[PDB]
Amino acid sequence: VYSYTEKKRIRKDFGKRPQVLDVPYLLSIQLDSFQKFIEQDPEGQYGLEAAFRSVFPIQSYSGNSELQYVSYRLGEPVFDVQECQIRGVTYSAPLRVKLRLVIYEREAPEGTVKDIKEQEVYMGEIPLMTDNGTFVINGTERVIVSQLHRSPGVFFDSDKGKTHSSGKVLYNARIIPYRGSWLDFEFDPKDNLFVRIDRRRKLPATIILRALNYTTEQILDLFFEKVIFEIRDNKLQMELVPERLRGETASFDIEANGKVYVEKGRRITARHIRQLEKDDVKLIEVPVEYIAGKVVAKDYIDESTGELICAANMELSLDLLAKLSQSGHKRIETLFTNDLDHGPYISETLRVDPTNDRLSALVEIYRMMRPGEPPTREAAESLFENLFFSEDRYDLSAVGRMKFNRSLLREEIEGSGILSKDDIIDVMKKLIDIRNGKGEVDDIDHLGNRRIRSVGEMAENQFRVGLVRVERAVKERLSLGDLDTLMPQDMINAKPISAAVKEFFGSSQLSQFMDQNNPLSEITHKRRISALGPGGLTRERAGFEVRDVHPTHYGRVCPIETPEGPNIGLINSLSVYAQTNEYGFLETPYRKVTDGVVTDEIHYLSAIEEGNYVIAQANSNLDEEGHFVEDLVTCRSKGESSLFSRDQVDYMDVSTQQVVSVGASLIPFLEHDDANRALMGANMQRQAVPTLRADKPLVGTGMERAVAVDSGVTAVAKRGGVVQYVDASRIVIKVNEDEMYPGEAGIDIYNLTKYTRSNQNTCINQMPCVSLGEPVERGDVLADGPSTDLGELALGQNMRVAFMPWNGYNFEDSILVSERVVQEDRFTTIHIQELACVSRDTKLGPEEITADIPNVGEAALSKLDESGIVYIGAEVTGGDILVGKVTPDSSLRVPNGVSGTVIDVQVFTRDGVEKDKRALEIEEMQLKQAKKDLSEELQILEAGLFSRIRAVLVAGGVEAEKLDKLPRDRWLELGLTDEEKQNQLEQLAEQYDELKHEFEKKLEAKRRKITQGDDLAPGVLKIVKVYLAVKRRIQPGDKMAGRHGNKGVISKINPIEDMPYDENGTPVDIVLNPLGVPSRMNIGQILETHLGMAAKGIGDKINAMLKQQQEVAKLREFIQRAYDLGADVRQKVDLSTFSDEEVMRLAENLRKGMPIATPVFDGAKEAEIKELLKLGDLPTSGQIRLYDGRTGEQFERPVTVGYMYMLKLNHLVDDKMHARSTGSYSLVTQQPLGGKAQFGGQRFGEMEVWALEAYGAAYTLQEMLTVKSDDVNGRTKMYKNIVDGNHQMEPGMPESFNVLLKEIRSLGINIELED
């Protein structure tokens, strides 16, 4: 099938792989999250419900008067989005929560409430997300970028070999909670087990166990297995499990049953224990020498004296053995300790510690945490109980609990966020198990451990923090005051909540200013996941391994889109198909392949879960039913590309386009560039500035349409219908009746945006792209925003390049442009500059805006109304006047250089100052447009009502001739019978009446909103903003680029008579250097140039056979021939179903080259490019034979021409040039100001002084840092001497030296200059 709007230009679409999953809605990442944030939520797991339920109910100190939660509602905005931009105030919504305070009785746990007082309390606004994923905070449009951080859980790191200077392997076990304190267990070269909290001073680990209601016996039982010694008549026969002996030496004669099983001197091996277990050896005698080498487990106390015989965890020596041997106890418990399979780490740690009891442990911790205050028993108890085991102050998130349990091989995923003794001891045991050798560490680059926050989760955390501050306030107040008098609102005051939310949105490291100079720039500023922010690493401390690309980013994060510079690899971009888990982790889809057949069920796989399977490759040839044709297919089992059999696979990749972000998928022939060139191309295609007349790619990737529609730039139809009225300022679409609601007789009005400033000072307009009477179906564009063309994404123009050297005017990266391109305004852009005059009320006279200006003639006054403000449409230049304002001479002058007309003036004034005459004129104008537009919103409804009257008034004493005599209104009092017909007439009259009422009631408010003043900064009368609109051309110095990272700066604008011209006469339009390509291996550009030449050849053939008119039969035949060419091309357009009028419009849209779509990784091939070149008339090698314009001679060595798509980046030479001779100087250190806004001078940093010292130029340096910069009297004398005619200086001495001298002097350090 084909739409009736995608049928105007069909992209000849190469590419063999029939994809199954369509590209999802690219903005879902932020739309879904902020949808979750605000949603009236039964069962309240996420959103504001979660926060309120967490913080409420609030209970005083048994004050018998407590407050709970009922419901919450979001009101409506006071202002819609567009006027929020126009005015400057946040697009918000008010939050109202149904609180309910209830007063108990005396001694009333069981006692019913005596008073119930309820209302809605107003607590603060919350900014809302416009339907494009953006927020409007103060006029400006901000984006709250996602954040990638470490998921809460337990992480066992190595610290491999960079400690102790001896290649020891330490081991660490960290607990990261969602809100609390990091708890760390760690090892020491001496093989102790230490703990620490908050990365502060370190302690022996076991102390925490001593604080958890434990004695030494329990600890030893926990972390060791017991061994039994039995005092016997013959030297302590010992009970032996064979498995406890493997990998050990023979220190004695292993004997039993009157038999020696294993002899001394040898070593126990696998066969030895085999012999032992086959024989079922129970007990073995052993000399006391080996018994002396174990440590006693339990504290042993004499039954006679009631005194200790031998405390635990100390070496058994022959003296102690003798003393205890006759004590009468014949059973001794020791600790199995093999230096390979086990280790007594806890034993030595118990040796180290200075504590013995719970009191000792708690006081040690308390002295550890807060020094200065002497310890107190109860305070320390409360503290250590509150530091980890009070859910109000510590909390693993539910994701934290899931990771915690999964890591420790537990079985449930649900749990409780408060820590437990079992969990701590189990972490300890896992850490020791890693130390022993069993188990392996967990890295921190794995995308299983890293988790995406978003606007929803960040906003919830901020709102929660604010609300707990407020509940602290209400709790403090609620224990006091007379309860029955106060309504439940006079204690909240809502200040902290609004303060916290506004502060997070307005000024946060992630809620940042929007990049808006494209549709691509926005749609890829929103799908950005930033490693930085509060609760994340930082650029300086950022490591060197996190910046690298892990083998598990396949399908989740782009490898070739990351802004090089200080933060490379910390700011990632989210892949095309990647979605986010229920918890935060990133999924990507995969086709299920049960047997060899590749089934068509798609399962989303997370990061950890992707390793176990063996996942096939996106491009693995399969033959029309799903058997992998090849014998050995490629897969990626566990982070290791490898080669697997025809049937081991358990998944396949959805699409070949799923590994790359959206911005890197618009580059054609990506699989021919180097990776670096692809990165630079993906990064410069986001700076392209939108030009006057957009031009389609003509070699694309089929992602232009989705990118253009999936941003909010283009006005797309909501319900399909038939166009009814088109215009440069609005569109009116008549909805088809089938889609229409049951009533309301709706039509669709679209108010196109016209010449407004973007954040980057560009022009965002929208051109209608539909004619009158044009049927538009649901979901089809109507208005082509900037850099958009028929709903595609047109970032630049497609230009006829030739690759050759041309007299060194394209030496390194320079470009050599024809003047034919300046002539046509191909690369001309429109910038808009918003200048502001702030009219304060100063002292020495309150200021004004009078047009009267002293000390000026009539040159400056000829471009003003009598109020001084400029007529809308007046060209101005540097140093002119735009607003009249004089001292009691602060008139807003045009700053230097900025030129062009004045397209818009806006004046806001506060309620209290009389509007001035131009304010009167402007507000009246706005009122008139409001009334006109909202009378236009009246429609055929009333005419339909009159027709209904006429139909009901068909006859029955009716004047058929006089129906059209008088206006249609008076059709109700005419003659009629006395039946239901007259009642229906009265009902129609009623309808007419409430139609008036309903429209008038809405129309009134606009008067109020327009009339009123607005909130300025305290102390200011009124803000006047002018909107100049310069128009930038192209010129030498302007930076230009392609899509493959082949940037360069325009060097010459060469006359058209000089360009090389092929024999047919057509001059070449850009000349690019060949020497670029082989070094920086971007072969993409050559292939794009050849495919462009092929496509424009086809377009020329169509334009020839159309201009020199030939019948539509030939056109459909040729277009079909062009649309077949290929092999297994998946498109297969059927052209015989167009009716010889769709073909004509189409072929008229193809007279400028046939577009092509070359998907990212299975694009066209060389052979098919050659075929398409043949289908035109062009030489197959790609290279034509050119002539030299200046001499007319022929170039040896045939040269490569073609059509390459060139962008124009926003680094314009006229915004970079700057110069200074003498201006204004800073105050403290009398040195020139820095910047181009200030008339500033160039910094002469240290390195340049070193260069000058190296040459030996001493006088140049002296005049460079004494006269030209800083010596005040010296530089005035220098200026005077230069004007006079004598070139000489009296240096003197700096005045930024005396500053230093005095600042050191204002310490206690007398510094002076000597003889």
């Binding site: 002097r1305 204002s1306 206690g1308």
Partner: protein, 49 residues
């Protein structure tokens, strides 16, 4: 060019000389810095002769 000054009601220690690490005052009075700062911040008494 013209400075000013403030008369402290009592003496006070110059931090630069006190805790430059190494500290001038410390190894001029051959006695550690922990106790010197403790005395300075009014937490112990130091005898003289």
């Amino acid at each position: 060019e013209r400075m000013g000054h403030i008369e402290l009601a009592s003496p006070t220690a110059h931090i630069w000389f006190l805790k430059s690490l190494p500290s001038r005052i410390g190894l001029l009075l051959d006695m550690p810095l922990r106790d010197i700062e403790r005395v300075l911040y009014f937490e112990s008494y130091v005898v003289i002769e």
